[PDB]
Motif scaffolding. Structure first.
Motif, PDB file in Angstrom:
ATOM      1  N   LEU A 164      20.617 -44.557 -21.791  1.00  0.00           N
ATOM      2  CA  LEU A 164      19.985 -43.243 -21.822  1.00  0.00           C
ATOM      3  C   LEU A 164      20.566 -42.326 -22.890  1.00  0.00           C
ATOM      4  O   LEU A 164      19.999 -41.255 -23.133  1.00  0.00           O
ATOM      5  CB  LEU A 164      20.081 -42.574 -20.447  1.00  0.00           C
ATOM      6  N   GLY A 165      21.666 -42.707 -23.522  1.00  0.00           N
ATOM      7  CA  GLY A 165      22.131 -42.032 -24.714  1.00  0.00           C
ATOM      8  C   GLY A 165      23.356 -41.166 -24.454  1.00  0.00           C
ATOM      9  O   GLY A 165      23.645 -40.751 -23.327  1.00  0.00           O
ATOM     10  N   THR A 166      24.084 -40.897 -25.537  1.00  0.00           N
ATOM     11  CA  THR A 166      25.219 -39.979 -25.536  1.00  0.00           C
ATOM     12  C   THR A 166      25.015 -38.989 -26.674  1.00  0.00           C
ATOM     13  O   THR A 166      25.024 -39.377 -27.847  1.00  0.00           O
ATOM     14  CB  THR A 166      26.545 -40.726 -25.696  1.00  0.00           C
ATOM     15  N   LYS A 167      24.824 -37.718 -26.332  1.00  0.00           N
ATOM     16  CA  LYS A 167      24.613 -36.668 -27.323  1.00  0.00           C
ATOM     17  C   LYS A 167      25.967 -36.101 -27.736  1.00  0.00           C
ATOM     18  O   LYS A 167      26.627 -35.411 -26.952  1.00  0.00           O
ATOM     19  CB  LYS A 167      23.703 -35.575 -26.767  1.00  0.00           C
ATOM     20  N   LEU A 168      26.383 -36.396 -28.964  1.00  0.00           N
ATOM     21  CA  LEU A 168      27.633 -35.870 -29.507  1.00  0.00           C
ATOM     22  C   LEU A 168      27.321 -34.570 -30.237  1.00  0.00           C
ATOM     23  O   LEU A 168      26.783 -34.579 -31.346  1.00  0.00           O
ATOM     24  CB  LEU A 168      28.290 -36.893 -30.425  1.00  0.00           C
ATOM     25  N   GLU A 169      27.667 -33.448 -29.612  1.00  0.00           N
ATOM     26  CA  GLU A 169      27.387 -32.119 -30.131  1.00  0.00           C
ATOM     27  C   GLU A 169      28.661 -31.473 -30.660  1.00  0.00           C
ATOM     28  O   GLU A 169      29.778 -31.878 -30.327  1.00  0.00           O
ATOM     29  CB  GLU A 169      26.758 -31.235 -29.050  1.00  0.00           C
ATOM     30  N   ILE A 170      28.479 -30.446 -31.487  1.00  0.00           N
ATOM     31  CA  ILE A 170      29.582 -29.789 -32.181  1.00  0.00           C
ATOM     32  C   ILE A 170      29.995 -28.543 -31.410  1.00  0.00           C
ATOM     33  O   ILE A 170      29.155 -27.847 -30.822  1.00  0.00           O
ATOM     34  CB  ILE A 170      29.196 -29.458 -33.637  1.00  0.00           C
ATOM     35  N   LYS A 171      31.299 -28.270 -31.396  1.00  0.00           N
ATOM     36  CA  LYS A 171      31.847 -27.119 -30.691  1.00  0.00           C
ATOM     37  C   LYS A 171      31.792 -25.876 -31.568  1.00  0.00           C
ATOM     38  O   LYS A 171      32.136 -25.922 -32.752  1.00  0.00           O
ATOM     39  CB  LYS A 171      33.292 -27.383 -30.265  1.00  0.00           C
ATOM     40  N   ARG A 172      31.363 -24.763 -30.974  1.00  0.00           N
ATOM     41  CA  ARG A 172      31.339 -23.478 -31.656  1.00  0.00           C
ATOM     42  C   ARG A 172      31.783 -22.397 -30.679  1.00  0.00           C
ATOM     43  O   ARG A 172      32.161 -22.676 -29.536  1.00  0.00           O
ATOM     44  CB  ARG A 172      29.951 -23.173 -32.232  1.00  0.00           C
TER      45      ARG A 172
END
Lengths: 214, 211
Positions: B100-108
């Protein structure tokens, strides 16, 4: 590397239609081609392997054909669960390359957007940043332009745009454009406007406000 | 079918961080496992096949490992072009199922959302359904709460939410919360409010209207 070119890039069709999308390889690849389907915000799914063989669970409405360089995928009668993006992929030689995709959308009548402009809140201003928001609600087709104007001067490179997928409600699209500036810059000017051009508007619609109005 | 479960569903990181993503199969699949990468609105890209073999062109920062049921993908030093969604897929037995996926998002930094309330249009009321929309614009993190209040009655079971993916410029999110009532029930009540709770809001902000 083997380059895969899909056609068309997008397709506006109605439910019950018969559609055919094409995928061409830069070299011959025999029947070494896969067709994947992917809906927005969901994982991809392998629909067709070896150019023609359907995987388990896939309805017989999908058909894959082609051998060599040109391949096609045909949906006999489009259903609401078929409107998605379709990708082709060669499995002939490394690297195994993907086509850029074909997006299927539901075709409908042209709808003009409802445009709203919102100044920044004083709370956000107390942080030193100012975000002027321009909302375009329920328009078709998806292609719209938003141009920010500050004191009748064109702005560029200082805005961010987010667009929704095709709404399950009315098959329209919605968009937000946020112009983000420093508090100093925002206070250095007065008239803030967003000009919207769209196929459904006879002329571009401008939503404006003088700094101070809320 | 073989069920592929990925973890975590989402991961917040920064440039230079080392990250690991896990993929598990419901049964042994040896090393018949692929890792794909995909950015929002863009085509997928096969990064790794045979669990550990990197595809031609992938930088050496990506490392695949595992055999049997447990598999990992490691990124040593996260680059801006590395922030994407990563999928695993077993290639041992048809159907070749995806995770189902792994969303690697950026920290802000924390960004409070701007809240707008929109009542249904009369052209929408001609469908017998009234959709009241509450929009949250430019916020971080994704974690938010939207509570609907019809005549000061807290609602449940009739509101849906849709969240955008991380914006490529400001790294913020945007959310829509649609309360879906029938036209008669909508014409039966008066005040409609949405209460927004977010990490960037000390007090929950309430946007309302009165028909």
């Amino acid at each position: 590397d083997i380059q895969m070119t899909q056609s068309p890039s997008s397709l506006s069709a109605s439910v019950g239609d018969r559609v055919t999308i094409t995928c061409r390889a830069s070299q011959t690849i025999s029947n070494f081609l896969n067709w994947y389907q992917q809906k927005p915000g969901k994982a991809p799914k392998l629909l067709i392997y070896a150019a023609s063989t359907l995987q388990s669970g896939v309805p017989s409405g999908f058909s894959g054909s082609g051998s060599g360089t040109d391949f096609t995928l045909t949906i006999s009668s489009l259903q609401p669960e078929d409107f998605a993006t379709y990708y082709c992929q060669q499995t002939y030689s490394t690297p195994y390359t993907f086509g850029l995709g074909t997006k299927l959308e539901i075709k409908r009548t042209v709808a003009a957007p409802s445009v709203f402009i919102f100044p920044p809140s004083d709370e956000q201003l107390k942080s030193g940043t100012a975000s002027v928001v321009c909302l375009l609600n329920n328009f078709y087709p998806r292609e719209a332009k938003v141009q920010w104007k500050v004191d009748n001067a064109l702005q560029s490179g200082n805005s961010q745009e987010s667009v929704t997928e095709q709404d399950s409600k009315d098959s329209t699209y919605s968009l937000s454009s946020t112009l983000t500036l420093s508090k100093a810059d925002y206070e250095k000017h007065k008239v803030y406007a967003c000009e919207v051009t769209h196929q459904g508007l006879s002329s571009p619609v401008t939503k404006s406000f003088n700094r101070g109005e809320c």
